Each structure stands twice: as C-alpha cells, then as structure tokens.
Amino acid sequence: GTMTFQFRNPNFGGNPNNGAFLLNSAQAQNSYKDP
Amino acid sequence: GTMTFQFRNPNFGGNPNNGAFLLNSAQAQNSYKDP
Amino acid sequence: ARPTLMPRAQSYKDLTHLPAPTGKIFVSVYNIQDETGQFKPYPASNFSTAVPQSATAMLVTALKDSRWFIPLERQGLQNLLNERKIIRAAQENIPLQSLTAANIMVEGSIIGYESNVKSGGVGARYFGIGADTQYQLDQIAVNLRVVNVSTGEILSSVNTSKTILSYEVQAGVFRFIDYQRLLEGEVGYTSNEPVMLCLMSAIETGVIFLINDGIDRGLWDLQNKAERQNDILVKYRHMSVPP
Amino acid sequence: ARPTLMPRAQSYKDLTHLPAPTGKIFVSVYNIQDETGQFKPYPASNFSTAVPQSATAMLVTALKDSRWFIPLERQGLQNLLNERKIIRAAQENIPLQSLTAANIMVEGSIIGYESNVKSGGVGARYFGIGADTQYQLDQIAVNLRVVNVSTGEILSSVNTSKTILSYEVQAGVFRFIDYQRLLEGEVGYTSNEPVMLCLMSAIETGVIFLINDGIDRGLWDLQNKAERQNDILVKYRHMSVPP
Amino acid sequence: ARPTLMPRAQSYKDLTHLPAPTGKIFVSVYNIQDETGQFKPYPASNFSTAVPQSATAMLVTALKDSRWFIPLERQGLQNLLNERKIIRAAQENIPLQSLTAANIMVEGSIIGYESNVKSGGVGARYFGIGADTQYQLDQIAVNLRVVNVSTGEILSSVNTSKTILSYEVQAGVFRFIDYQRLLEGEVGYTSNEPVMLCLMSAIETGVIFLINDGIDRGLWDLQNKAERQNDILVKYRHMSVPP
Amino acid sequence: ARPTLMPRAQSYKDLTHLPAPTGKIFVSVYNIQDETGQFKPYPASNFSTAVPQSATAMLVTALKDSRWFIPLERQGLQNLLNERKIIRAAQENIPLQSLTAANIMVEGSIIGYESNVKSGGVGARYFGIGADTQYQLDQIAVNLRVVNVSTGEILSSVNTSKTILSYEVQAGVFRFIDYQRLLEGEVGYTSNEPVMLCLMSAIETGVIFLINDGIDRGLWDLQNKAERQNDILVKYRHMSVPP
Amino acid sequence: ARPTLMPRAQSYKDLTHLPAPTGKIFVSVYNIQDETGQFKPYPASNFSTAVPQSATAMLVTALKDSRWFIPLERQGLQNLLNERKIIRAAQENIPLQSLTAANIMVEGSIIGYESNVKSGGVGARYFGIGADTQYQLDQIAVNLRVVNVSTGEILSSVNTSKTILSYEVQAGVFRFIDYQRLLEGEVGYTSNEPVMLCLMSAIETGVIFLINDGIDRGLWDLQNKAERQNDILVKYRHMSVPP
Amino acid sequence: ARPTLMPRAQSYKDLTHLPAPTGKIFVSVYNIQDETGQFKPYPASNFSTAVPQSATAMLVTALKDSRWFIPLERQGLQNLLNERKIIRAAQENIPLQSLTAANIMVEGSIIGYESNVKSGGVGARYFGIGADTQYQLDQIAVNLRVVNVSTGEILSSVNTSKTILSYEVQAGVFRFIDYQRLLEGEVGYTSNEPVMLCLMSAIETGVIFLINDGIDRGLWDLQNKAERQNDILVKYRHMSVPP
Amino acid sequence: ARPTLMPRAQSYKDLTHLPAPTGKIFVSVYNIQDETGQFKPYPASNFSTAVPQSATAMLVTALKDSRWFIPLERQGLQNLLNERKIIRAAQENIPLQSLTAANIMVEGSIIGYESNVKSGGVGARYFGIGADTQYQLDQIAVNLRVVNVSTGEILSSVNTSKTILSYEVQAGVFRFIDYQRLLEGEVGYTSNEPVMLCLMSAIETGVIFLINDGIDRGLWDLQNKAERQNDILVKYRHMSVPP
Amino acid sequence: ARPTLMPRAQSYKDLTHLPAPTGKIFVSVYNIQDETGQFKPYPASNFSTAVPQSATAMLVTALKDSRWFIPLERQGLQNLLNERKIIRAAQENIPLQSLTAANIMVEGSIIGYESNVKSGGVGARYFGIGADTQYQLDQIAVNLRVVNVSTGEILSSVNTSKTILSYEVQAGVFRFIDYQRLLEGEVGYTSNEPVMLCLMSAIETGVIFLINDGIDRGLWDLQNKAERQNDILVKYRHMSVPP
DSSP: OOOOOOOSSTTTTSOGGGHHHHHHHHHHSOOOOOO | OOOOOOOSSTTTTSOGGGHHHHHHHHHHSOOOOOO | OOOOBOOOOHHHHHHHTSOOBSSOEEEEEOOOEEOOOOBOOTTSOSSSBSSOSOHHHHHHHHHHTTTSEEEEEOTTHHHHHHHHHHHHTTSOOOOOOOOOOOSEEEEEEEEEEESSSEEEEEEEEOSSOEEEEEEEEOEEEEEEEEEETTTOBEEEEEEEEEOOEEEEEEEEEEEEOSTTOEEEEEEEEEEEOOHHHHHHHHHHHHHHHHHHTTTTTTSOOBSSTTOOOSTTTTHHHHSOSOO | OOOOBOOOOHHHHHHHTSOOBSSOEEEEEOOOEEOOOOBOOTTSOSSSBSSOSOHHHHHHHHHHTTTSEEEEEOTTHHHHHHHHHHHHTTSOOOOOOOOOOOSEEEEEEEEEEESSSEEEEEEEEOSSOEEEEEEEEOEEEEEEEEEETTTOBEEEEEEEEEOOEEEEEEEEEEEEOSTTOEEEEEEEEEEEOOHHHHHHHHHHHHHHHHHHTTTTTTSOOBSSTTOOOSTTTTHHHHSOSOO | OOOOBOOOOHHHHHHHTSOOBSSOEEEEEOOOEEOOOOBOOTTSOSSSBSSOSOHHHHHHHHHHTTTSEEEEEOTTHHHHHHHHHHHHTTSOOOOOOOOOOOSEEEEEEEEEEESSSEEEEEEEEOSSOEEEEEEEEOEEEEEEEEEETTTOBEEEEEEEEEOOEEEEEEEEEEEEOSTTOEEEEEEEEEEEOOHHHHHHHHHHHHHHHHHHTTTTTTSOOBSSTTOOOSTTTTHHHHSOSOO | OOOOBOOOOHHHHHHHTSOOBSSOEEEEEOOOEEOOOOBOOTTSOSSSBSSOSOHHHHHHHHHHTTTSEEEEEOTTHHHHHHHHHHHHTTSOOOOOOOOOOOSEEEEEEEEEEESSSEEEEEEEEOSSOEEEEEEEEOEEEEEEEEEETTTOBEEEEEEEEEOOEEEEEEEEEEEEOSTTOEEEEEEEEEEEOOHHHHHHHHHHHHHHHHHHTTTTTTSOOBSSTTOOOSTTTTHHHHSOSOO | OOOOSOOOOHHHHHHHTSOOBSSOEEEEEOOOEEOOOOBOOTTSOSSSBSSOSOHHHHHHHHHHTTTSEEEEEOTTHHHHHHHHHHHHTTSOOOOOOOOOOOSEEEEEEEEEEESSSEEEEEEEEOSSOEEEEEEEEOEEEEEEEEEETTTOBEEEEEEEEEOOEEEEEEEEEEEEOSTTOEEEEEEEEEEEOOHHHHHHHHHHHHHHHHHHTTTTTTSOOBSSTTOOOSTTTTHHHHSOSOO | OOOOBOOOOHHHHHHHTSOOBSSOEEEEEOOOEEOOOOBOOTTSOSSSBSSOSOHHHHHHHHHHTTTSEEEEEOTTHHHHHHHHHHHHTTSOOOOOOOOOOOSEEEEEEEEEEESSSEEEEEEEEOSSOEEEEEEEEOEEEEEEEEEETTTOBEEEEEEEEEOOEEEEEEEEEEEEOSTTOEEEEEEEEEEEOOHHHHHHHHHHHHHHHHHHTTTTTTSOOBSSTTOOOSTTTTHHHHSOSOO | OOOOBOOOOHHHHHHHTSOOBSSOEEEEEOOOEEOOOOBOOTTSOSSSBSSOSOHHHHHHHHHHTTTSEEEEEOTTHHHHHHHHHHHHTTSOOOOOOOOOOOSEEEEEEEEEEESSSEEEEEEEEOSSOEEEEEEEEOEEEEEEEEEETTTOBEEEEEEEEEOOEEEEEEEEEEEEOSTTOEEEEEEEEEEEOOHHHHHHHHHHHHHHHHHHTTTTTTSOOBSSTTOOOSTTTTHHHHSOSOO | OOOOBOOOOHHHHHHHTSOOBSSOEEEEEOOOEEOOOOBOOTTSOSSSBSSOSOHHHHHHHHHHTTTSEEEEEOTTHHHHHHHHHHHHTTSOOOOOOOOOOOSEEEEEEEEEEESSSSOEEEEEEOSSOEEEEEEEEOEEEEEEEEEETTTOOEEEEEEEEEOOEEEEEEEEEEEEOSTTOEEEEEEEEEEEOOHHHHHHHHHHHHHHHHHHTTTTTTSOOBSSTTOOOSTTTTHHHHSOSOO
C-alpha cells in the first residue's frame, strides 16, 4: 500500500483541485437561509 | 493489471478532476425541490 | 495479518499428489532468468520488473515439494563455493563430501508478460447508484526445459502460461436524497492476482509438464510404471494440446 | 484462473504435424538477440522492452516440439559448463559424456517491432448509445538462420512477421432517461494479442520456413523424401512468396 | 518517540518458544537476495525498492533468536576476511581460530512483492459528515531453503507469504452550520504495515517452517525427540497445507 | 492474424530476379551498426531506438535470398566460436572443417533517420462532417560497403534511402441531427510504414546497388557477362544518379 | 544558528551511564550498509536515500562514547592502509606498530525504512479559523550483530527500531472581518524528526542491546559482575521483549 | 514509397565531376566522431542524438564516389581483423594479402549542431483564413582534416557548415459560413531538411575543400596539373573565404 | 540551402592576416576538454551539452589556418597509431617515417558557459500591434595554454570569452478591423548565435592571444621581428587588458 | 559580438600588480576538483553542473598571470606523457629535457555552491506601470591549498568565496489608455553574474591569499622583502579576517 497521508480538503494540505468540488458541494447542500 | 485502488470520488481520495463532473451530475439529476 | 504459507493454487495440489519416482532425481536450477524484459507500467515504478526476478528460487520449491526432484543450490553457487572453501580451511587445523552430479538440470526463462492481454470492463450507473467490473487480464508465461548436462541435449522443453486476473469492482453512489442533502459512498475491491503466485503456479504447472513429458520420452521412470491412472498425469496429458 | 499451456496459434498445429526427418538434427540456439531496440511506449514502462528478450528460449520450444530438431542448451551455456565442472570434481573422489556436436545452429534475431503499423479505429455514437472499435495493429518480425558451424555458412535465412492485433471495443452509453434521471454504462473489452504469443507463433512459422527452405537446398533430408503431399510444406511453399 | 526493539509480530512469539535442539546448528546466511525486482510506486521514489534489501540481515536475527541456529556472518564476509588478515599481521610481531564449518546454510530470496494484491476500500458520506476505509493489501513472499553445503542438496525449501495491511481511515466532514458559516474537519489515520516488519515476520514464519519441515525429513533432531506436543510445531504443521 | 512471411517491398522482387553469378560469393556481415543515434519520440519510449538494431541480421537475408552471396554468420561470431570449441572437445573422445574465407565483407551502417522529413497534412471539416490526411514522412538511410578483407579496400560504398510513409486518415463527424439529439462518429486509419520493412527494403535496394556497382568496377563477374538486358540492373543503373 | 553537538536522544543518556567493563573491548565497524533500498519520495530527490548511508560512522560514535568499546577505523580501511604504507617509506630513510586484533566486530545493516508507517492527521476548521495536526510517522530499523572474527559466529544479533515523528501543525485562518475587508494568516510548524538522529538513537539503543544481550550469554564480563542494579540494563532487559 | 538512392544535394554533383588524380589516394576513415554533444530536443527523445553518429560511414561514400580516394574500412577495423584471423586459420589446413598503407587519413568530427540558429516565422490570419511560414534554421558543421600518418602532420583541416532548413507552412482556416454553420480546414506541410542529408552534403563539401586545399599546398597532384578551369575547383576556391 | 564554409567571425580575418613565423611551429592538440559541465536547458535535451565537445577539432582549424602552427593529430591518436601499426605489417611482406616532435602543445579547456548572462528583453504592444526584442546573451569562455612538452612548463595561458547573442524579434498583431472581423499576424525571427561559431571565434581569438603573448615572452620569434606595426597584433595587445 | 578577453574582475587587477618574487615558483595544478556536488536547477539541465568543472584550468591562468608562479600542465598529464613518449621514438631514428620538479603544488577544490543564498526581490506596481528587482544571490567557494610535494605538508590552505549577483529588473506595464484601447510593454534585463567569472575571480582572490599567507609563514620570499607597502598585500591582509 505504501500509502502516505494526504487530506481530501485543500485547507489542510490535500489535493487543491477538489476544492472546486468540495465548496460547491455544500453550496448544493446547505439548506440555510438568512434569519 | 497491476491496478491499485483509487476512488472515483474526490471526497475519499480519488482523482479530484471528476468532482467538477460528479457534483454537477447530481445537480442535473436530483428532482428535489424545497418543501 | 496472519503469516501463513504462500497461497498455492490448484496446480500445487496436483504437484504434491504426483506419484513417486524410482529415487528422486538430482537436478540443478541455475538461473531461470527473467528475460521478459517487461517492467511495471505507471503508477508503479519504471525500474520495477513486472514479474519477479526469482523464478530460479520458485522452481526450486516446485521441484522439491513435487517429491520428484532433489534440487541443488546453483543460484548462489558462488555463495556456496565460498562456504566450501571455508571448510577446506576449517578441517585442516567430518570430512567434506563433494557436490552431487545433477545429471539433469532445469534451465529456463520467464519468456514473457504482456500487460493487459484480454483486459476490459463493464460499467453501469443509474441515477445515483452505479458499479463497474473492470478486469485487466495479464498473462505470464514461463519456459522450463530439462537439460541432460552430460550431453547438453534439451530433453523436454515446455511453455506454460497463466492469465493473471486483476479485477476491480467499484460500486460508487452519488445521489441526492432531500432538498440540499446528498448521500454518497463508494465501496471498492481490486483483487489483483499477484504475479508472484501466478509465476509460482505456472511453474508448478510446468513441473508436471516436465514430468509428464519426461515419462513418455523414456527420460526417467516412476515407481510402478504400469498404472497411468492418477488424475494428475492424465489431466496434464489432456492439457498437453495447447489452445 | 486455469493454468493451461501456452495458447499456441495455428502455426504450431502445422509444426507438430511436420513429417519426421532421418534422425532429429542436433541444433543449438545461443541467443536469438532482441535487437529490435524497441521498448514499450506510455503508459507502459520506458525500460520495458516491447517484445520479450526470450526468443532464445522460445525457439528452443519451437525446434523441440517440431519433432525435427534436438535443441542444445546454449543460452545459459556458462551455467551448464559450471555444472559439468562439478561432475569433474564429483566422479573423481557413470562417467561423464561430452556435449554433442550440433552441426547446424539457429542464430537469429527479433529484427523489429514497429508500434502501431496499420492501426486505426471506427467510432460511432448516437444520442446516448455509442461504441468504438479501435485496433492497434503492431507487427513483430524475427530472423531465423540455420548456420553450418563446421564452415560458418548461413544455410537458410528467413524473415517471418506476425501482425499483433490489439483491438478494443468500448460500448459506452450516456443517456438521460427521465427528467433529472440519467442512465450510463460502458462495457469495454481490449483483447491485446500478447507479443510473447506472436513472438512464439512467428518463430514457429520460421521453423517451418527453416525446414521447407532446408529441404529444396539439400541441406537435410526427411524420412521418405518422395511425398511432398502434406498440407504443411505446400502451404509454407505457397507462403514462400513474400507480400 | 521511544526507541524500543523491533515490533515483532505473533510469529516471533512462536519463534523464541521453539524447543531446543541437540546443540544449535551452525548455519550461514550469505545473501537472501532481494530479487523481487519490485520498486516502490509513486509518490515514493523510483529507485526505492519496495521491500528492503536486507533479508540477509533479518534472517540472521530470525535464526539467532530462535535458539536453534548459530548464524555465521557471510553477508560482509569479505569485510570479515579483511579483519582476519589483520590479526595474521597482528599476532606475528591468543592464537587465531578458524571459521566454523556451517554444515547447512540458508540461501534464499525475497521471491516477490505485488503491489495492491487484494486492495480496496469502502466509502460513505452523508450531508457533511463522511468517512472512508481504504486498505491496500500488499503481499510479500520469501524463499528460505536449507542447503547442505557438503553435498549441495537443498534440504527444505519453503515459501512463506505475509499480507501487508496498509489501511487508511479518513473521516472528513464539510458541512454548513449557519447562514454563511461552515464547519469542516478531517481526521485521518493511515496505518501502513511496514514492509520491513512483514519481511521480518514472514522470515520468522519461514524459520519455523524450516525447522518443522527439517524434523520430519530427519535432517536434524531436537532435544527429547518424542514430544510433538508444543503448539508451535503442530500449529505450523496445520499451516503446512498452503491455501 | 495470419503469420505470413515478412511483407517484402517491390525491391525484393527485383532482388530474387537478379541474374546468377559465377558462383555465389562468400561474404560476411559483422555488424551493420545502428549509428543513427536516433531514438523514438513521444509517445514512444525514450530508450526505444527509432530504427531496429538489426540491419546485421536483415542484410544477411538480403544477401542470401539475392542468389548472389553466401553470407557468413559474424554477428554472433563469439557465439559460433563457442560452438566450434565444443566440437573440438566432442570429436576428441565427421572431422571439423574450417570457416570459409569470405574474401569480401559488407560492413555498413544505418547512417540516419530524421523524424518527420517531409511531414504534413491537409484538414477539412464542414458542419459536422470532417476528415484529415496527416502524413509524417520519415526517411531512413543505410550504408552498405563491400570491403575486400584481403587488402582492406572499400570496393563499392553506396547510400540508399527510403521514405517511411506514416499517414493517418481520421474522418470524424460531430453533428446535431434533431433538437437535443447528436450523432457522432470517427473512423480512423493510421498506416505507419514499419521502419523494419523500410530498413529491409532500403537494404535490399543497396544489395542491388552493391551488385550493379560491383559489376562495372570489375570486382566480380556474373554468369554470361554479355547481356545487360534485364530490367533490374538497368533500372538500378538509371537509379544510380542520386536526386 | 548555534553549532552545538548532535542533539542526542534519551537513549544516549543511558549510553554514557553504562557501567564500565573489564577493559574496553577492541571492536571494528566495517560498513553498516544502508540496505534499506529506500530513497526519499517526492518532493525530495529520487537519488536521495531516505536514511543516511552513514551508520558505519554513527555506530563508531555509539561504541566509543558508550565507554565499553574501542572502535577501529574500518570504513576507510583502504584509506588507512594507504597511510600505513607511507610510514613504511617514511621511517626507512618511532617504529610503526600493528593494527589491533578487534576480536569482535559489529557488522550490521539499516534493515529498513518504510515511509509513513502509522501516519495520519486530524483537521478542524470553523468559519475562518482552522488548524490541522498531520503527523507522518516513519520507522527506521537497524541491525547490529556482534561477530567473533576468530570463529565467524554471530554472537548477539539485535534489531532495534525507532518511529520518526514528522508532524506538522498549520493553523491557517481565512476570515472576512468587515464588508470588503479580509484578514488571513497561516502559522505553520513542521517538526520533522531528523532521520539521522533516529538512526543515531536506534543504534545507541542497539549498543545497549548489544551489551545487555552480551552479558547474559557470557560473551564479555563487566567490572563488578554482581550488581545488576542500574536502571539502564534492567530497563533494556524489560525492553528485551519486542512488541 | 520508391526506394531510390540517397537524395544527394548539389555538392555531390560537383563531387563526381571532380578531375581525376594521378592514381586514387589510399585513405582511411577511422571515426568521424559525433562530438557535437547535441541531442534532439522535445518532442524527440532525449537519448536521440541531433545529428547521426555515422559521419565515419558517410565520408567513406564521399571519398569513394569522388573518384579521388580509395577509402579503407577502419570503422569496424576490429570487425575486419577478426575476419583476417579467420583466413589465417582457413588457408592453413589464394594466399592472403596485407592491408594497404593509406599514407593519408581523414580523421575528423562533426564539430557542432546548434538548434534553431536563424529560426523564425511569419504569421498572417484574416477573418477565418490564415497561414504561417515558420522555419527553424538549424546549422550542422563538420571538421575534415587530412592527416599524413607517416608523420602525424595535419595537412588540410577545413570546417564546412550547412544550414538545415526545417520550414513548416500551415494554412489553417476557421470560418463561419452560414448561421450555425462552420467550415474549417488546415493544410500543413513541414519539410524538415534531414540532418543526415545535410551531414552528407556538408561532408561532400568538405571533400572538395580537402581536395582544393590539398592541391595548392602540394600535398597531392591531379592528372594534367595545368588546367585550373573546371567550375568545381574555382567555385570552391571562391567559397574558400569564410563568411 | 547553400553548403558554404563555416561562417567565420571577424577574429578569423585577423587570424589569416597574421605575419609569418620563422617556420611554422609543430604543435599538438590532444583534447581541449569540454569541462564546462554545462548541458542545454529545456526545451533542449538534458544530455545535450550546451557547447560542443569538439574544441580539440576546432582549435586544429584555428592553428592550421593561422599560418603559424603545424597541428598534429592527437585527438584520435589511438586511431592513428592503429594505422601506423598496419604499415609496419604492410611494408614487411616508401619506408615509414616517425611522428614529429611537437615541442609545444596546446592543452586547454572550454572553461565555462553560463546560460543567460546579460539576458533581457524590451516589450511593447499598443492596440493590436506589438513587438518584443528579447535577447538571451550567453557567454562561452575557453582556455588555451601553450605547454612546452620538453619541460612541462605552461608558457602562455590565456582565457578568451565571447558573448553569444541569441535575440528574438517577434512582431505579433491581434487587432479587430470591422465588426466581427479580426486580422492577426506574427512575424518572428530568433537569430541565435550558434555556440559552435562562438566556440570557434573565441578559440581563434585565443590563438592570436597565444601568438601575441608568445612573442613578448621570447617563446618563439616571427619572421622580421622588428615591425610590430600590423593591426592584428597591436589590436590584440590593446585587448590584452581584460575588462 | 566582440570576442574580447575574459572580463576579469577587480581581483585580477590586484593580481597582475603583485610584486615579483625571487624567481617564479614552479607549481603544478592537477585537478581542482568540482566537488560541490551541485548541479543547476530547473529550467537548466539536471546533468549541468552549477559551477564549471574547470577550476584546474582557471587556476593555471590565475597562477601564470600573477607573475609569481610557473604553472605546470598536470590536468592532461596523461595527454602530455603520450607526447613525451612520441619524442622518445622521434629522436631515436634537440635532446629531450625532463619535466621540472614543481616543489609546491596547488591541489584544491570548489568546495561549494549553494543556490540562492541571500536571494530576494522587491516588487512594485501601480495602475498599469510596474517594476520588480529580483536578485538571486548565489555563492561559490573554492579551496586552494599549496602543498609541498617533497613532504606532503599542506602549507597555506585558504577558502575564498564570491557572491554571484544574478539580478533581474523587469519593468512591465499593462494599462488601458482609451475606451477599448490598451498599451502594454515589458522591458526586462537579467544580468546573471556568470559563475565561470566568479569561479575565476574567487580563485584569483585565493592566489593572492596563497601568496600573502605564503609570505608570513616563511614558505617563499619575494624580491625586496622589506617593503610591505603595496595596496594589494595589505588589502588582502585586512581581508584575512573572515566575516
């Protein structure tokens, strides 16, 4: 396996290309509006 | 085959470039609106 | 992790059940040379050979546990002769015997290893749920030839292959459940057949093909050479026609 | 996975059905050198040779199972002479015979392997459904020359080729079914012809071309040299005009 | 960091509890050659071998701490003979003894190491919260053969494997909490089984497989050869049938 | 796949129809060295030579099947002398003859191989439908010089070239048919001329250029040296002016 | 930067406090060979070895500062013998002594270094503020075996490991403060445990494991061999059971 | 493809029309070493030399077809001396002559090959239609020096260059024709001057520069040394002033 | 393409107009070693040396065409001594002379080649129209030292440099002309100064600097050593103060 | 381009103005070895050494033009001894002298070259207009030690450094001028200090540091050893305290 530890989130040092998918995911699942 | 295990989804550590296709896929197949 | 033996295939179960010969033949394995010339592709290393460089040490196990051959250490023969020269300086301060004759030898090669021979894969994915079955069928092939070292004649030269089945089943879902809610999950299992085990199982196939093709030629006789009834020799005689 | 023999092509079925000669000729295969100088492209490794470095071990199988030649071990000849020197120190504590003469030898080469010779592919895809047939026709070529070692004369030097058919059929669909519903699926099958089997089958073609061109020159005679009726020799005489 | 010993597996606990032999056998380990031919893939270096090149130094620990063998230094034998030649020039200005005989030797190999043999992973992620369990099951295999250096005969040649369990558990969340507020966090743990410890534990498995298969053949006898009751030998006799 | 002979070009049809000489000349091909210094570009491997390293084995076929020369095995000459030394130890327990003189030799080189010499391609695509014709004209060139080994004089040194025609025709369509309907399809065919066949055909051109330029110099005479009528020699005399 | 000594770990504080032996034993360290076969991954160089190739120079410090051994220079022994040959030509125009005997030697290896053994990391990030703790736990392991050079017997062969703790703490914020105003900042600290210091500390662990396992075997005796009370030997006897 | 001769430039037409000397001079070409040290850039291979390593075989053609020199085979001289030693063992069972003297020799080099010396390109594109003319002018240069082997003196050392004209003309259109209709097309032609032909033509320039500068120095005389009228020698005397 | 001579710089026009010496001095150029250690950057090959490895063949031209030195072939001296040994076996079946003394020799080096020394470029672009002038000023430097071989003394050791002017002028326009109409065009010209010509011109500068600094030291005298009037020697005496 | 001398720094102006010694000392420079072990980073080649491998040829210029040393050719000493052996065979058909003693020698090294030591850069850009000053301060360092070859003693071993100033000034504008009009332009100048000139100037600094530290030790005396007034020696005595 020789598998290192990389994050799946670019704030902690993972692959930065999934951030264009990560943030828009919770932009597509938030269900929160202004009070 | 010498084929390792990579995910097809960037949340679990696969190729992060398919996330721009994965999320917009379910944005094109959700059929769910606000209650 | 449980450190068991090497997970030997079906061909080793035919190997130990081979009938006994009239004395196990002294044989010598020098270097079953990895001359596939084939290294592993990306993502694996470029210097990483696609099959092991160790068929000279695997065939030794295939000839010893067959209960047909007494293999001789000729891989590190210069490492063994450095030990014999020490005993010549140790007893001159049990007498040392000489190395046995090994009237036949199994020279050979791993003759090839084409990556992705009959590879392929089916993929299916409905709304959200989805799964693929991608199999990358490799194929190793080994040469094992019994050579009479007294005359240099190659006695029985066989070529056995084994299809390495490296399949993956990734069942990945990506499905919205409620409004602004998303479930996803990807169960995946890639069972690569290890090339060391298929190098081991194609060599153990070749040892039965060395013995079965070594009987009809009259090269060596087994104990009670009248039976021809066991389902190892007649199975590897019906497998003697190559597809 | 079932470890059968090497899946030999149609040319090996003509090889075993060759007529018997007046005694099988002692022959020696030193090194059918992989001097294609051709390594495998990306995605495969740069150090991975595109054909095997093992035609010296494949031709041995092609000359032994032809029932025409007794091949001699000359690939690891320095590995065999290290074994003969052991028996010289073993019996001096059956007498050892000498190596046979091998009046002819098959020196040769894998003379080339151009990647993607007549490659190509048709693709078609309507709304959703779609499939391609992409075939990458490689071509190996081997040289096999019988050399009289008593005089150094090259007797019959033939060049046989074989087109490696590496085709893929990927039938991939991507089609919406309902509103915000999507079916997709991709069945794919890439049957690469293994280069080790086409190295094996072009060499077995060359052995028949060594024998058929070795008969009309008067180099060696077969048993009952009056027939010329079998559909192996006359087929490989109508194949003696190169396209 | 606490520098303890090597974290030896369960197989070493069976190794020290082996019964004592009638004198510990003098044995010599020259070079358990890393002929896996397998280097580490990306992201690791291309020149980095996937297993250590040090099984000649690991088996020495496996034979010494087994309380069955007296191993002899033959890895740096040319480094030891340069020291013996110094004492020949030192005392000629205790007398020097000679090297012991080492009537058996353990030649061997690391016969293979296929990357990602039974690899795979399950992934699950709901709204925000999510975790995967991706395990990349490697498999090392070693050959350990006891060779009688007086006759060159390979006495007991075994092949033991060990599945390297390299699993990762990444539990990463990405969830909005309030309007224009976002919590996220990713706890991750990849416990790669070290290949040096699985090279060590499969060799220590092989030493018990050298001893257990060295008893029934009559190669060497243990002290009080009537018991056959300890749960190391009968466990490694029920493990003597390879899966 | 049908394993036929090597698909020899038009120049081999002029080669077998050459007139017979007064005895076929003993000739020796040591190493037609691939000193192009040219390896294959991307996507092919960096270590992969752009032409084969096998013109010493191709010219042997070009001199033997020309019915003008008896070629001698000098590529693996150290592999042939190891066989002659065996017969010296075999008959001393037919007498062995000596190697023939080979008064001329064909030393030579593959002198060059510029990638994409006169390469280019036309492309056309209307609404949806479209096709390109991209041809990458390579050019190999070989040197073949007949050298009198008795005096070292280079007798006839010719330089023949051949333009490798590697063309592709990809006819790819991408056209909407109805509202939210799309047909597409791409038929493609890249017929690379194999560099091994153009190395073979430029060498067979050179053998006729060795013979035709070897006649007017008085180096060797053919049988019935009065005709000068056959359309091989006068065609390769009108081709003797280089463009 | 203050150039202090090497920042030795806790195991060196147990090393200098070892009890004195009856004369410090002459010992020789030839080459503790880096046969990890492990190079550093990306972003580091591919030719850069992951551990130093200098355990033959580190163990010398571990045996000299232990106050138990007099190490002898055998790493550059051919560099020392070139100096002794100069004094043979210098005094022949104090007399030169001879090299000492060094009745035991510490041959050994760095037996392995798996990258990212128990690696992992926790990440947390609220609105703006956020921090991760990513630790990549490597593991070196060394072999140190005392070899009696008079007989070649390996006396005490131990395997000590040390987990390299390479952790990073990046506390990075990205938070809007006012309308069209943004504060951000990232404090980060990656304290890699240096592999040279963990090679040094695992070897110094091994020297205590050479001495403690060299006392119970009767290989060498310490001064006042009745105490067994110091908290170095009994600590490294409770650490003698490997996890 | 028509396998003609090498497409020799204008300088070879001046080479064959050179006047005859008083006997063709025996000359020897050992190794015109490719010490450009220049390999081909991307997309070509890194190991691919930018010029051929074959100027020792090209100059042989330039000296033989000049009708001024009898070149001697000294490239594979160790391949020719292995053939002469065979005739010494062949006739001792025509007598063998000796190699000729070759009083002058042409040692030399390919002294350089700067990629893209005077490179450049004009591009123009209006609405839709457009074309570029990009030419990458390389420059090879060779050294050819006649050396009197009797005294070691370099007689006439010349440096001839040739600008490799590698131009491309891509005329590509991309133009809408109707509403939602698009025509496009790209005709392209890259006529790289092959570096093997410019190595051949600059060497053939150098042979005329060897002969013309070998006449005024009195090194060798031509037949009827009174004319000085032919438009090869006076053209290469007006070209004797370097730009 | 017109194959003229090497386009020699202004310094060669001063080289041929040097005054004649009292007999041209016998000199020998063994290997002006390319020990820049500098290879060409991307996009050029990594193995491609940035300057040629051929200053031992360029300086020969610079010393021969200077009309001051008789250079001796010492680059392929082992290729010339293999020719002299042939004449020793040719005349023993004009007598052979010996090699001349060459009392001075020019050993030397290409001492450096920094890429982009004073590089830079101006860019300007208005609406549509635009052009840049980017020049990458390299700098080669060579060492040429005259060494008296009778005593080993280095007589005159000079270091001459030359700035390689590799400039590009790309004048590219991109301008709309009408509504939905666009004209564009890019004329570009990169005149790289070839490094082989600047290696040639800095060496020819060094030969004048060898001669001018070889006159005032009294190492060798020219014919009519009273003038000191020619504008080559006084120009290279005012250039003898290094900037 | 004007091929002047090497643009020597300020330290060479102090080098020629050094006072004369009582006879210039015979000295020998064998190989000032580039053991920086430092190659050039990207974009330059990986095999390209960061400093030249030519300090053995630069120091020769620094010792000869100092008017203090007579350097001897010892770089190509095996190239000079091959010339002396020719004169031994030339005069035996002026008598040859012997090589001078060279009682001191300057062995040494380029001891290091850290890329980007004190590198940095200021950047400023307003609306449209903008410029940066980025300087990458490298640092070479050389070792020059005078060694008495009669006793092997290193007499004066100095370490001189020089900061390579590689600065760039790019003044690039990008500014709209009118509505739908844009002016832009980028003037850029990167004056890399060439590493060959800073290797030359730090060595010439070291030669003054060899001479100044060679005077106070009494190793060699200058002519009129009473002055100590010149502003070269007292400047390089105030520079003798290292920062």
